[PDB]
Design an enzyme around this catalytic site. Sequence first.
Site, PDB file in Angstrom:
ATOM      1  N   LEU A  44       0.809  -1.213   0.000  1.00  0.00           N
ATOM      2  CA  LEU A  44       0.000   0.000   0.000  1.00  0.00           C
ATOM      3  C   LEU A  44       0.842   1.263   0.000  1.00  0.00           C
ATOM      4  O   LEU A  44       0.403   2.309  -0.471  1.00  0.00           O
ATOM      5  CB  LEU A  44      -0.918   0.022   1.224  1.00  0.00           C
ATOM      6  N   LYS A  48      10.275   5.893   4.777  1.00  0.00           N
ATOM      7  CA  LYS A  48      11.680   5.817   5.157  1.00  0.00           C
ATOM      8  C   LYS A  48      11.917   4.842   6.299  1.00  0.00           C
ATOM      9  O   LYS A  48      12.961   4.192   6.359  1.00  0.00           O
ATOM     10  CB  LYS A  48      12.215   7.193   5.564  1.00  0.00           C
ATOM     11  N   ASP A 155       2.581  13.971  14.710  1.00  0.00           N
ATOM     12  CA  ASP A 155       2.642  13.794  13.263  1.00  0.00           C
ATOM     13  C   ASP A 155       1.231  13.820  12.682  1.00  0.00           C
ATOM     14  O   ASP A 155       0.884  13.043  11.790  1.00  0.00           O
ATOM     15  CB  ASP A 155       3.378  12.502  12.879  1.00  0.00           C
TER      16      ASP A 155
END
Length: 329
Positions: A44, A48, A155
């Site tokens: 999907l 990193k 995040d």
Amino acid sequence: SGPVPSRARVYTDVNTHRPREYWDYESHVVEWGNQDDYQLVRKLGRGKYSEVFEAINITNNEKVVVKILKPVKKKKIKREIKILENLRGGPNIITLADIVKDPVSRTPALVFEHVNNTDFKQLYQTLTDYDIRFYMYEILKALDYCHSMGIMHRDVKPHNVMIDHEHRKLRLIDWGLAEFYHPGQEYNVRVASRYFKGPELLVDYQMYDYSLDMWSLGCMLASMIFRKEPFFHGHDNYDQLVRIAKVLGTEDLYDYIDKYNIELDPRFNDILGRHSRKRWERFVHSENQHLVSPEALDFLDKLLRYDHQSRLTAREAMEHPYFYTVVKD
Ligand SMILES: O=C1C=C2C[C@]3(O)COc4c(ccc(O)c4O)C3=C2C=C1O
């Protein structure tokens, strides 16, 4: 003459009064499941720090999502795992279903519940005024929950908010950057996606808190109601603050820097310049006015504030008029 210290105004000592085992993730011992229970079906996405695949639990034919990590110190992996376990069952928090050792990569693979998502790049184009208010309220539930549990997500961005629109189902994902809040602790400012970084990170103020997520959330709200994703599009971290200042103004930015006695990087002198605070109405046009209301602008205004201490908490945000209809159900 260093920076002035800061403390979260809410959930300040949640971890201070919890057993060491709750927040001491480094001492956490992983309970491994059986990797032979899963079969990868389709990749999907690749990042990193990992690769995500759509998988199948061959023991019950249930669809799941597997996040295979890349080697990256046990500590970092344990933190994400402990945070996921602590928050499991929370409203709209992605459910960690299993943890296995991938035989091919020789690295840990986190197994999550599957969400039949609709990429934000496509979805955000069809959302209605009520849809935005509804999903914002649902994201707030997740944030108030994790914050109340002493955890900062760090995040928050469209990609980390999975939505199964037909089922009006939302899940806040990727807790790989999440951390436990401890009053007085200086955190790494290298977190969150550039476009969603709060002013505190851009000016290198390390004693931030849960309020960081509220700024990121405000950035999302703006992109949604004004139909401009991302809203603050900087070329780099320095330019990111410039894009913010061109909207919020330099007056309040400097008042913020003064209040906390923050030393501004030398390479921030000639780029910030001088900018007046623009009215939110300046971003309203024919193609987005149907998603804008006095309530939405007032709410956005209470989220996108330079001073982290002046931003609404997730709980207070939920009480805003903007959500009256959603609350009513
Ligand atoms: O806990 C989770 C759960 C997911 C599920 C998912 O929901 C699936 O789909 C994804 C993805 C990440 C990147 C990507 O590109 C993609 O397509 C996912 C996650 C990340 C996490 O940390």
